[PDB]
Design a protein around this motif. Structure first.
Motif, PDB file in Angstrom:
ATOM      1  N   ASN A  57      12.745   2.349  -5.798  1.00  0.00           N
ATOM      2  CA  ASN A  57      14.080   2.421  -6.373  1.00  0.00           C
ATOM      3  C   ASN A  57      15.147   1.810  -5.465  1.00  0.00           C
ATOM      4  N   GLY A  58      14.742   1.024  -4.461  1.00  0.00           N
ATOM      5  CA  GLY A  58      15.712   0.388  -3.588  1.00  0.00           C
ATOM      6  C   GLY A  58      15.630   0.762  -2.123  1.00  0.00           C
ATOM      7  N   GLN A  59      15.336   2.017  -1.861  1.00  0.00           N
ATOM      8  CA  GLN A  59      15.368   2.649  -0.550  1.00  0.00           C
ATOM      9  C   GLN A  59      13.977   2.658   0.060  1.00  0.00           C
ATOM     10  N   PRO A  60      13.855   2.844   1.374  1.00  0.00           N
ATOM     11  CA  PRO A  60      12.528   2.736   2.002  1.00  0.00           C
ATOM     12  C   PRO A  60      11.663   3.955   1.674  1.00  0.00           C
ATOM     13  N   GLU A  61      10.348   3.783   1.806  1.00  0.00           N
ATOM     14  CA  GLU A  61       9.374   4.863   1.641  1.00  0.00           C
ATOM     15  C   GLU A  61       8.586   4.961   2.935  1.00  0.00           C
ATOM     16  N   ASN A  62       8.624   6.117   3.582  1.00  0.00           N
ATOM     17  CA  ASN A  62       8.173   6.165   4.962  1.00  0.00           C
ATOM     18  C   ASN A  62       6.774   6.728   5.167  1.00  0.00           C
ATOM     19  N   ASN A  63       6.188   7.404   4.186  1.00  0.00           N
ATOM     20  CA  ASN A  63       4.848   7.958   4.375  1.00  0.00           C
ATOM     21  C   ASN A  63       3.800   6.895   4.048  1.00  0.00           C
ATOM     22  N   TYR A  64       3.712   5.926   4.952  1.00  0.00           N
ATOM     23  CA  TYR A  64       2.716   4.876   4.894  1.00  0.00           C
ATOM     24  C   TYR A  64       2.197   4.585   6.289  1.00  0.00           C
TER      25      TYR A  64
ATOM     26  N   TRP B 133       3.387   9.683  -9.066  1.00  0.00           N
ATOM     27  CA  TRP B 133       2.701   8.517  -9.607  1.00  0.00           C
ATOM     28  C   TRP B 133       2.380   8.664 -11.093  1.00  0.00           C
ATOM     29  N   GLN B 134       1.954   9.853 -11.525  1.00  0.00           N
ATOM     30  CA  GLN B 134       1.684  10.008 -12.947  1.00  0.00           C
ATOM     31  C   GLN B 134       2.989  10.149 -13.700  1.00  0.00           C
ATOM     32  N   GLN B 135       4.028  10.555 -12.990  1.00  0.00           N
ATOM     33  CA  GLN B 135       5.375  10.555 -13.537  1.00  0.00           C
ATOM     34  C   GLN B 135       5.825   9.137 -13.881  1.00  0.00           C
ATOM     35  N   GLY B 136       5.273   8.131 -13.210  1.00  0.00           N
ATOM     36  CA  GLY B 136       5.519   6.747 -13.554  1.00  0.00           C
ATOM     37  C   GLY B 136       6.527   5.989 -12.710  1.00  0.00           C
ATOM     38  N   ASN B 137       6.689   6.346 -11.436  1.00  0.00           N
ATOM     39  CA  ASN B 137       7.686   5.688 -10.607  1.00  0.00           C
ATOM     40  C   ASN B 137       7.176   4.329 -10.144  1.00  0.00           C
ATOM     41  N   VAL B 138       8.104   3.461  -9.758  1.00  0.00           N
ATOM     42  CA  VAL B 138       7.744   2.131  -9.281  1.00  0.00           C
ATOM     43  C   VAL B 138       7.922   2.064  -7.772  1.00  0.00           C
TER      44      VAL B 138
ATOM     45  N   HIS C 127       6.986 -12.714   6.686  1.00  0.00           N
ATOM     46  CA  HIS C 127       6.124 -13.602   7.436  1.00  0.00           C
ATOM     47  C   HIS C 127       6.772 -14.973   7.425  1.00  0.00           C
ATOM     48  N   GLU C 128       6.593 -15.708   8.523  1.00  0.00           N
ATOM     49  CA  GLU C 128       7.270 -16.985   8.674  1.00  0.00           C
ATOM     50  C   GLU C 128       6.820 -18.017   7.641  1.00  0.00           C
ATOM     51  N   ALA C 129       5.642 -17.843   7.038  1.00  0.00           N
ATOM     52  CA  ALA C 129       5.145 -18.839   6.106  1.00  0.00           C
ATOM     53  C   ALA C 129       5.503 -18.508   4.660  1.00  0.00           C
ATOM     54  N   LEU C 130       6.180 -17.389   4.438  1.00  0.00           N
ATOM     55  CA  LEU C 130       6.687 -17.015   3.133  1.00  0.00           C
ATOM     56  C   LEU C 130       7.984 -17.759   2.838  1.00  0.00           C
ATOM     57  N   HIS C 131       8.252 -17.936   1.560  1.00  0.00           N
ATOM     58  CA  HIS C 131       9.436 -18.655   1.135  1.00  0.00           C
ATOM     59  C   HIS C 131      10.603 -17.682   1.268  1.00  0.00           C
ATOM     60  N   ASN C 132      11.694 -18.118   1.908  1.00  0.00           N
ATOM     61  CA  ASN C 132      12.755 -17.205   2.347  1.00  0.00           C
ATOM     62  C   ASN C 132      12.225 -16.069   3.266  1.00  0.00           C
ATOM     63  N   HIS C 133      11.036 -16.213   3.849  1.00  0.00           N
ATOM     64  CA  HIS C 133      10.446 -15.235   4.761  1.00  0.00           C
ATOM     65  C   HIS C 133      10.011 -13.905   4.132  1.00  0.00           C
ATOM     66  N   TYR C 134      10.086 -13.721   2.812  1.00  0.00           N
ATOM     67  CA  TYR C 134       9.612 -12.438   2.305  1.00  0.00           C
ATOM     68  C   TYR C 134       8.941 -12.581   0.950  1.00  0.00           C
ATOM     69  N   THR C 135       8.161 -11.561   0.612  1.00  0.00           N
ATOM     70  CA  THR C 135       7.600 -11.432  -0.722  1.00  0.00           C
ATOM     71  C   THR C 135       7.388  -9.956  -1.028  1.00  0.00           C
ATOM     72  N   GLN C 136       7.330  -9.639  -2.308  1.00  0.00           N
ATOM     73  CA  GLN C 136       7.173  -8.258  -2.703  1.00  0.00           C
ATOM     74  C   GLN C 136       6.282  -8.185  -3.946  1.00  0.00           C
ATOM     75  N   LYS C 137       5.489  -7.113  -4.044  1.00  0.00           N
ATOM     76  CA  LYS C 137       4.659  -6.853  -5.215  1.00  0.00           C
ATOM     77  C   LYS C 137       4.765  -5.390  -5.579  1.00  0.00           C
ATOM     78  N   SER C 138       4.883  -5.123  -6.873  1.00  0.00           N
ATOM     79  CA  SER C 138       5.165  -3.772  -7.322  1.00  0.00           C
ATOM     80  C   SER C 138       3.924  -3.121  -7.903  1.00  0.00           C
ATOM     81  N   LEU C 139       4.013  -1.805  -8.048  1.00  0.00           N
ATOM     82  CA  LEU C 139       2.878  -0.939  -8.335  1.00  0.00           C
ATOM     83  C   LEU C 139       3.424   0.230  -9.131  1.00  0.00           C
ATOM     84  N   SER C 140       2.878   0.444 -10.316  1.00  0.00           N
ATOM     85  CA  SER C 140       3.290   1.571 -11.127  1.00  0.00           C
ATOM     86  C   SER C 140       2.079   1.992 -11.943  1.00  0.00           C
ATOM     87  N   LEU C 141       2.139   3.193 -12.521  1.00  0.00           N
ATOM     88  CA  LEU C 141       1.044   3.620 -13.391  1.00  0.00           C
ATOM     89  C   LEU C 141       0.747   2.541 -14.439  1.00  0.00           C
TER      90      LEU C 141
END
Ligand SMILES: *[C@@H]1O[C@H](CO)[C@@H](O[C@@H]2O[C@H](CO)[C@@H](O[C@@H]3O[C@H](CO[C@H]4O[C@H](CO)[C@@H](O)[C@H](O)[C@@H]4O[C@@H]4O[C@H](CO)[C@@H](O)[C@H](O)[C@H]4NC(C)=O)[C@@H](O)[C@H](O[C@H]4O[C@H](CO)[C@@H](O)[C@H](O)[C@@H]4O[C@@H]4O[C@H](CO)[C@@H](O)[C@H](O)[C@H]4NC(C)=O)[C@@H]3O)[C@H](O)[C@H]2NC(C)=O)[C@H](O)[C@H]1NC(C)=O
Ligand SMILES: *[C@@H]1O[C@H](CO)[C@@H](O[C@@H]2O[C@H](CO)[C@@H](O[C@@H]3O[C@H](CO[C@H]4O[C@H](CO)[C@@H](O)[C@H](O)[C@@H]4O[C@@H]4O[C@H](CO)[C@@H](O)[C@H](O)[C@H]4NC(C)=O)[C@@H](O)[C@H](O[C@H]4O[C@H](CO)[C@@H](O)[C@H](O)[C@@H]4O[C@@H]4O[C@H](CO)[C@@H](O)[C@H](O)[C@H]4NC(C)=O)[C@@H]3O)[C@H](O)[C@H]2NC(C)=O)[C@H](O)[C@H]1NC(C)=O
Lengths: 207, 120, 207, 120
Positions: free
Chosen positions: C148-155, C181-186, C193-207
Motif C-alpha cells: 500500500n505504499g509503505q515498507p514491510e519489514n518482516n522479511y 493474504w487471504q484477505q487479499g492485500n497487495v 540494481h545498476e543494470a535496471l532501467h532507472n535503477h529499479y523494478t517491482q513485481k506485485s503479489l496478491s491472492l
C-alpha cells in the motif's frame, strides 16, 4: 606467533552413513626456526590417538601451516560430544585450546514446500523450480533434486539463513528446460536433517 | 642504510640473457620470501617471479620457462636469470621481500629499481 | 603486525541521489606501543585529502581499531574507478596498501519473479511470500518489500549465490499474517540494481 | 614459568566487602586484558569483570554497581573491589589473561582460585 583454527565436519558428512565426517585443526604462521608441532586430541576430555596428520605446508610468505584431521563417528557428533585440539610449539609459551562441537539447542525438523515457476518465467527457455525449506535447527542439512529417482544436476541452493525466531531457512533452485516442465515431468525436492525420523522427507512438484 | 640494492641491469638484444641479482642487509631477509617485480613506462608494478625461504619458485605466465629465479640463503641474495628476452621485457625490475598470499602480497622492503632495455 | 581491511559502499547508496556512498578502511591489531596511524587515499592513483577519520577505539583484547571513511561519487564507483587505502604505522617497515573496486565484467539485468505461498503452508498461522531474483551481475543489489505504499519489514533475504552461467541469484521471504493474504492485500517486491532501467523494478503479489 | 596468584578471599558477611588481588608473572600481562571469573560448585564459570590495558571496564550484569575492577599497569596486579556482598556471590574466584572479544573470550592464563564465602 602461530594461530589455530578448528573446523567442524562438512554437513553432508554428518548425515549419511556412507560418508566419514572429520574435524580439522589448522595451525598457520609457524616459523622456519621452529617447524615441528605436536597435536593432542581429546573426546569429551579423554585423549584419542586416532587422528591423522599430514606433512607441513610451506606457504607463499615462507610460513608453515600444519593440518591434522580427526575422523569422528556420526553418533558422537549428533550426541554433542566436544572435540578439543591442543597445539604445542616451541614458539608458544603455552599450548593453545580449541574446542568444537555440534550446535547447541533443541533440534527442529525442516518443513518442505515446493513452488512452481512463476507464470511469467514461461516465456523463457528454462524455468526455475524452487524448494523452500524452513523451520529447521541446527543449520546442517542436505537438499537435492531428482527426477525418476536419478539425480538432477542443474540446481543451486542458498546458504542457511537465520529467521526471526532462531530457526533456519534456505531455498533451492532447479532450472529445467521449459519443455521439460511442459512435458509433464515430476520433480522432487529431497532433504535430510538430523531431526527427521525416517531418514529423509521429500515433496514433489509438477505441472 | 640502503636495505635492498639490486645490481646488473642494462641494454640487451632480443634473444639474449641477463642476470639480475639483489642483496639484502643482514636480518631483514631472514626466514622470508624474496620476489621480483617489474614496471614498464606508463604501466603498473607487476609480478615477475618469487622464491621462498624453503625454495619454492613462482613465476608469472609471461616469463615461464624463459626466466628462472634462485636464491643463496647464506648470502641474503636472490638472482633472476632472464633468457630469450624480447622487447616486451623492457622495464624497471625490482626485487622485494614479501608477505601475504600470492593474490594479495605485502611488501616489507623494496629495491631501488634497475632498468633493463631490450632493443630490436 | 596490524592488519587492514577495505570495504565497499552499500549497494543502495550508490544508486540514489539522496544517499551518500563511502569506502571504509579498517585497521585492526594496532598496538599500544605504536598507536599512531596515518591514512593516505588515492582514487585511480590521484591522492585525495577528503577522507574523514575516526578516533582510535580500544577493543576487548586491548588492541586498537581505527577506521577511515572516504565519501565517493556515485558515478565514479559505477564507472569502475579504483579506490586505494594506504596505511602507515611504525610497527610496520613499509605501508600497507589495499585497493577496492566495483566488480569487472558486463552488467546483467536482474529478472524478478514473485511466487505465492505454497498450498501446504496455508494450514500454518503465517505464510511466506517469495521473491526470486536471478540473472544479475555484479552481485550488488538491494531488496525490500512494500504494501500500500509503505515498507514491510518482516522479511529476510539470502546472500547472492553464484549460478552456472556466471550470473547471481537470491531469494527474499516476506512473512505476513495469513489472515492478511487471504484477505487479499497487495504486496510488492522492490529491487534496485545498476543494470535496471532507472535503477529499479517491482513485481506485485496478491491472492 | 607463567603463573597467576589470587589473594584476598575468605569469609565475609551479607552486606560486607572483600577486595581480591591478582599478581601476574612478569611479561605475561603486558599490553593484555585481565578478567575475573567465578565458579560455584556444580555450576560453571561466569564472567565477573575485566579491564583492558587502556582501562576500559566490562562487567557481568550480576555485579554492576556492586563490584569495581581496577589495575596498576606497571605493578602487574589487578583488583576486584567487591562491595555489598550477597548470598550468591559465594564461589571460588579466578583471574585470567583474556583475548578474543567479550562475546567470545580466549583465556591465555588462569589463576589458582580463591574461595569467597558469605553467610547470612
Ligand atoms: C601467511 O600465509 C598464510 C596462508 O594464507 C596466512 O594464513 C591465513 O591466516 C588467516 C588469519 O590468520 C586465516 O584466516 C582464518 O580463516 C578461517 C576460515 O578459513 C577457511 O577458509 C579460508 C578462505 O576463506 C581458507 O583459506 C582456509 O584455509 C580455511 O579453509 C577451510 O579448511 C578446512 C580444512 O582445511 C575445510 O574443512 C573448509 O571447508 C575450508 N573452508 C574453505 C576452503 O572455505 C576463519 O574462520 C578465521 O576467522 C575466525 O577467526 C578470526 C580471528 O583471526 C576472527 O576474526 C573471525 O571473525 C573468525 O572468528 C572465528 O569465528 C568462529 C565462528 O564463526 C568462532 O567459533 C571462533 O572462535 C572465531 N575465532 C577467532 C575469533 O579467532 C580466519 O579468518 C586463514 O584461514 C589462513 N589461510 C590459510 C590458507 O590457512 C597467514 O596469515 C600469513 N601470515 C602472515 C604473517 O602474513
Ligand atoms: C582483537 O579484537 C579485534 C576486534 O574485535 C579483532 O578485529 C578483527 O580482526 C579480524 C582479522 O583478524 C577481522 O576479520 C576480517 O573480517 C572481514 C569482514 O569484517 C566485517 O564483518 C565483521 C563481522 O563478520 C565485522 O565485525 C567487521 O567490522 C566487518 O564489518 C563490516 O564493516 C564495514 C565497515 O564498517 C561495513 O561497511 C560492513 O557492512 C560490515 N560488514 C558486516 C558483515 O558487518 C573479512 O572480510 C576478512 O576476511 C578476509 O581476510 C581473511 C584473512 O583473515 C581471509 O581468510 C578471507 O577470505 C578474506 O580474504 C579477503 O577476501 C577478499 C575477497 O574475498 C579479498 O578482496 C581480500 O584481499 C582478502 N584478504 C586477504 C586474503 O587478506 C577478515 O575475516 C575482523 O573484521 C576484525 N573485527 C573488527 C570488529 O574489526 C582482532 O582480530 C583481535 N585481535 C586479536 C589479536 O585477537
Amino acid at each position: 606467533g602461530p594461530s589455530v583454527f578448528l573446523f567442524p565436519p562438512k554437513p553432508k558428512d554428518t548425515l549419511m552413513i556412507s560418508r566419514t565426517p572429520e574435524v580439522t585443526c589448522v595451525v598457520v604462521d609457524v616459523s622456519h626456526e621452529d617447524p615441528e608441532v605436536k597435536f593432542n586430541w581429546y573426546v569429551d576430555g579423554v585423549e584419542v590417538h586416532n587422528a591423522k596428520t599430514k606433512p607441513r605446508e610451506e606457504q607463499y610468505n615462507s610460513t608453515y601451516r600444519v593440518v591434522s584431521v580427526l575422523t569422528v563417528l556420526h553418533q558422537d557428533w549428533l550426541n554433542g560430544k566436544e572435540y578439543k585440539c591442543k597445539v604445542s610449539n616451541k614458539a608458544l609459551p603455552a599450548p593453545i585450546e580449541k574446542t568444537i562441537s555440534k550446535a547447541k539447542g533443541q533440534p527442529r525438523e525442516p518443513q518442505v514446500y515446493t513452488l512452481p515457476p512463476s507464470r511469467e518465467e514461461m516465456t523463457k527457455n528454462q524455468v526455475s523450480l524452487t524448494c523452500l525449506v524452513k523451520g529447521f535447527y541446527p543449520s546442517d542439512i542436505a537438499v537435492e533434486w531428482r527426477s525418476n529417482g536419478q539425480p538432477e544436476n542443474n540446481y543451486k541452493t542458498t546458504p542457511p539463513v537465520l529467521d526471526s525466531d532462531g530457526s533456519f531457512f534456505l531455498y533451492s533452485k532447479l532450472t529445467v528446460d521449459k519443455s521439460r516442465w511442459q512435458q509433464g515431468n515430476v520433480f522432487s525436492c529431497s532433504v535430510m536433517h538430523e531431526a527427521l525420523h525416517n531418514h529423509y522427507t521429500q515433496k514433489s512438484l509438477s505441472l | 642504510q640502503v636495505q635492498l640494492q639490486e645490481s646488473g641491469g642494462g641494454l640487451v638484444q632480443a634473444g639474449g640473457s641477463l642476470r639480475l641479482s639483489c642483496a639484502a642487509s643482514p636480518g631483514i631477509s631472514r626466514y622470508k620470501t624474496m620476489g621480483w617485480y617489474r614496471q614498464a613506462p606508463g604501466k603498473e608494478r607487476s609480478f615477475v617471479a618469487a622464491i621462498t625461504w624453503g625454495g619454492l619458485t613462482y613465476y608469472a605466465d609471461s616469463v615461464k620457462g624463459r626466466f628462472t629465479v634462485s636464491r643463496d640463503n647464506a648470502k641474503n641474495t636472490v638472482y633472476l636469470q632472464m633468457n630469450s628476452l624480447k622487447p616486451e621485457d623492457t622495464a624497471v625490475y625490482y626485487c622485494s621481500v614479501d608477505g601475504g598470499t600470492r593474490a594479495d602480497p605485502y611488501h616489507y622492503y623494496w629495491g631501488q629499481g634497475t632498468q633493463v632495455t631490450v632493443s630490436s
